[PDB]
Amino acid sequence: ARRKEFIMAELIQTEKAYVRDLRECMDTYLWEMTSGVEEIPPGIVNKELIIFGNMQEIYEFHNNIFLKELEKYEQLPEDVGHCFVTWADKFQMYVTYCKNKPDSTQLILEHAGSYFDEIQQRHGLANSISSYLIKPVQRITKYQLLLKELLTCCEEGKGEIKDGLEVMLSVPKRANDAMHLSMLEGFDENIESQGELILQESFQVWDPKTLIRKGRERHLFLFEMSLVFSKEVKDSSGRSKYLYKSKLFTSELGVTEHVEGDPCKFALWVGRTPTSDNKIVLKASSIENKQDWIKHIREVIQERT
Q1: How far apart (Å, rounded) are the C-alpha atoms in residues 303 and 290?
Q2: CB neighbourhood size of 146 (10 A)
Q3: Rounded (10°) CA dihedral 24, 30, 33, 39
Q4: Which of 123, 158, 181 is the last residue of a domain?
């Protein structure tokens, strides 16, 4: 219980430091951009929303809700996992922040010049803007680290510690999934209408529709309402994009786990009956990847039927 106390105390102390840091970042760098009288390099003029992402939304969540929620567990460390599960929906704002991070970094690197560095020097600030902008990303990692530490000294399956850790691990994962989704080209359909993106991954796929039947690489996006097939292609400089190919409705999906001759293969079909004209065979990169997809596909099929 001594190690648990050190962890809980650090969780709360660093939460206070985090809230203070976001506040200072907005009161200095952000304020200067929105109310300052300094020359803003045209490349970043009034583009604060891109530079700072939704930092204000994140600050309000921790300052109005999360620190207070964590403090309720100041003397109940083994049960703090519940906080993360309970407020999981709020943590979706971190997916938004992390998704935007690459753009912010680039807008600064190519159009900011020494604008922020000069603000730092003139105001005698300890933290550079880059040091502040990475804090929300680092905060999710810190939560993962603290929850993992609690797992080493808590009863298996209690206090939602593992469930809370999973919420924290899913955040960077969903941000990465969204980055790949942003590479999909040619899907002329509302993305929001597909429901939430659950998984995205590359597979070797055998299609009954191609002129020549063979395993071809395809990058799949499993949404709550549909499974989208796309093909990764690269341009001259090696930049990848995914060309939209087709889409199956999850409510109509059927899955076959075992395919003779390759433990990494599984099959999908649509409608009541599988036929040589509708059966798709997929080869995953590993048995673990195959099992994860089978699990999630079975889940969307169950939800939609």
Answers
A1: 20
A2: 21
A3: 50
A4: 181
